[PDB]
Amino acid sequence: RAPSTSDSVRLKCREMLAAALRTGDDYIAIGADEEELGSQIEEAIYQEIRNTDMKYKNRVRSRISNLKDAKNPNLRKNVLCGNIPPDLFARMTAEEM
Ligand code: NA
Ligand code: NA
């Protein structure tokens, strides 16, 4: 569903987001497509920021750090299950996460 990209920076960020989504192995039992979710999250970030510079990388990094948060597994699970859509997650504030 997310558009493809041929931008190497965007591709790496999609892969990094997919990897963060694998935290704790929850994605397997849930049956989530972690690569597709990663692409949808990245797409929403790129659509809002519209470049791959500092603000873009910061946003990607903050989504990743929260997905990897051992203290907040329900955040990741909500994204994996689709309770939180990827475009919402892309723009969620730290407070909201
Ligand atoms: Na965090
Ligand atoms: Na945990």
For 30-81, the three-class secondary structure string (H helix, E strand, C coil) is: HCCCHHHHHHHHHHHHHHHHCCCCHHHHHHHHHHHHHHCCCCCHHHHHHHHH
* Placement of tokens 């689709």 in the chain: 82
User: Ligand 2 is a single-atom ion; what residues have CB below 5 A from it?
Assistant: 70, 73
Report CA(40)–ligand 2 centroid distance (Å). 24
Report CA(67)–ligand 1 centroid distance (Å). 8
Resolution of the experimental structure, in angstroms: 1.9
Report the candidate in 83, 88, 84, 77 with the shortest Cα–Cα distance to residue 43. 88
- The sign of the dihedral angle between the CA atoms of 84, 38, 61, 55 is negative
Residue 54: both structure tokens together: 């500092």
Query: Residue 4 has what DSSP assignment?
Result: P
For residue 44, what are the domain limits?
1-97
Give the Cα separation of 80 and 83 in Å (integer).
8
Report the candidate in 68, 69, 15 with the shortest Cα–Cα distance to residue 41. 15
Number of folded domains that form the chain: 1
* CB 68 within 8 Å of CB 23: yes
Report CA(41)–ligand 2 centroid distance (Å). 22
Residue type, 55: K
